[PDB]
Design a protein around this ligand. Structure first.
Ligand code: NAG
Ligand code: CU
Ligand code: CU
Ligand code: CU
Ligand code: O
Length: 504
């Protein structure tokens, strides 16, 4: 089912069984993660009605529209503690924004705690009526979207120890090791046509190696940013990254396995495809309703992010020399006292959201809470951030709210590209020795989150806040009166309203 650009999103709890194990989950308009779609100039008005009442998972909510820059609408960006206070059970909040010409493949997810891990997440596609790559494919619709999701048999708040997915969900469906032969997702194609497949990771943690038996993947988009066409057999996708790839249905009519192998999971999930776990079906019209019997490519050409190149306005901003940006920041990641830190500080959410602190009179980073996690950025300048990998629990996929950035230096590469680098909004920091360097221009007044997108790391402190262009933040953003009321309502909630019932 589909949600339109002006619509209501009613959030409820119900039982779900995407892998044949039934447990309670979170539904949006009676559907597990429905598609949100519109056009690049639409004005979105999304009324989010929080009717959640199951105490085994988070009830208060906050929706993030991942990849949208939210210029002038920082109050609708959805990171609780930064842009808003949570929407409380029994209440509604109207988000109003526009893509402002930015087309691409995105996704929406709750930004509150680990609630998105329990299913409050889904694909969001913004179509371009002038798409630059329209000559490259014939079909692009609700049937060419492929979402990847990690799924747990117990509610996220009850996970004890290091999280390990029970299953990989492809378009909401999949199987777990030792589980029943639950229905697999089918992606239908016709021999001779070309399809713009939109691949989205909805993950709370695991990354996947994705490939389709017998077919190549011609990448033409990354994280809502178009690239020169670049063909590969297999790619590694991290939390919240998106790729559009042209699928050329040029093989014999047949059933082909679609494969998404996780880096971790219960009972051997990471190492097998046995019984159709970690799988979906690519079916050519005319093939029987049966399982594929194909096999993966033994020696795949692997996607390397430094091979991706931006199609439009390719050059990285600023002087084309490492360290020659207007503002040059280097962050030191750490893990101390059971908490991740950045430059010695572990992120903890303030009781007054940064945007509300700024609207209330804060004039500089020194006045903002929490102390040690907030970095001020000047207006209209070129920034270069460097975030060396090394810290445990990686690879850590960092994301920046409010901006897309050029990746002048990717993981696994020791070279810099200022002429043509891919532009994206979620980047892997790699492994020990890597020095991922990104660039962006500070053209979007407001407080924006910068943090690891593995939700278990975010909740243990791996986050910082950029207070960008503080002098123009009040003029640029003008939240509705309901926005400021969220905090009053939420601070007044009774203890039974936010209490988490654990399960074993
Ligand atoms: C943080 O710490 C590193 C290591 O001391 C230092 O080199 C870097 O300049 C610091 N970054 C910020 C933004 O303070
Ligand atoms: Cu996200
Ligand atoms: Cu991380
Ligand atoms: Cu975020
Ligand atoms: O996020």
């Amino acid at each position: 089912q589909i949600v339109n650009s002006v619509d209501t999103m009613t959030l409820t709890n119900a039982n779900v069984s995407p892998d044949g194990f039934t447990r309670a989950g979170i539904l949006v308009n009676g559907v597990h993660g429905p598609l949100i779609r519109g056009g690049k100039n639409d004005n979105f008005e999304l009324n989010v009605v929080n009717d959640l009442d199951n105490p085994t998972m988070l009830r208060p909510t906050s929706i993030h529209w991942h990849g949208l820059f939210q210029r002038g609408t920082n109050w609708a960006d959805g990171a609780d503690g930064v842009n808003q206070c949570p929407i409380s059970p029994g209440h509604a909040f109207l988000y109003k924004f526009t893509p402002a010409g930015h087309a691409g493949t995105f996704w929406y997810h709750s930004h509150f705690g680990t609630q998105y891990c329990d299913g409050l997440r889904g694909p969001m596609v913004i179509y371009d009526d002038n798409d630059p790559h329209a000559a490259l494919y014939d079909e692009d619709d609700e049937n060419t979207i492929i979402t990847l999701a990690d799924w747990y048999h117990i509610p996220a708040p009850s996970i004890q120890g290091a999280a390990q997915p029970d299953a990989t969900l492809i378009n909401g469906k999949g199987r777990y090791v030792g589980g029943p032969a639950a229905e697999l997702s089918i992606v239908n194609v016709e021999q001779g046509k070309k399809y713009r497949m939109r691949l989205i990771s909805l993950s709370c943690d695991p990354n996947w190696q994705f490939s389709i038996d017998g077919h190549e993947l011609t990448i033409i988009e990354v994280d809502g940013e178009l690239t020169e066409p670049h063909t590969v057999d297999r790619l590694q996708i991290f939390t919240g990254q998106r790729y559009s790839f042209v699928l050329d249905a040029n093989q014999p009519v047949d059933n082909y396995w679609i494969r998404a192998q996780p880096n971790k999971g219960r009972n051997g999930l990471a190492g097998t495809f046995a019984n159709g776990v970690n799988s979906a079906i690519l079916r050519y019209a005319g093939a029987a309703n049966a399982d594929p019997t194909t096999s993966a490519n033994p020696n795949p050409a692997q996607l390397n992010e430094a091979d991706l190149h931006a199609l439009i306005d390719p050059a990285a901003p600023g002087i084309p020399t490492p360290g020659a940006a207007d503002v040059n920041l280097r962050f030191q990641l750490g893990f101390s006292g059971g908490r991740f830190t950045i430059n010695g500080t572990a992120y903890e959410s303030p009781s007054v959201p940064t945007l509300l602190q700024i609207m209330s009179g804060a004039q500089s980073a020194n006045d903002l809470l929490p102390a040690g996690s907030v970095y001020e950025l000047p207006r209209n300048q070129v920034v270069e951030l460097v975030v060396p990998a090394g810290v445990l629990g990686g690879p850590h996929p960092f994301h920046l709210h409010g901006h897309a950035f050029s990746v002048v230096r990717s993981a696994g590469s020791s070279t810099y590209n200022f002429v043509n680098p891919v532009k994206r909004d979620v980047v892997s920091l790699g492994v020990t020795g890597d020095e991922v360097t990104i660039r962006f221009v500070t053209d979007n007044p407001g407080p924006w989150f910068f943090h690891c997108h593995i939700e278990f790391h975010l909740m243990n402190g791996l986050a910082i806040v950029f207070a960008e262009d503080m002098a123009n933040t009040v003029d640029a953003n003008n939240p509705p009166v309901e926005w400021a009321q969220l905090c009053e309502i939420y601070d007044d909630l009774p203890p039974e309203a936010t209490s988490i019932q654990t399960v074993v």
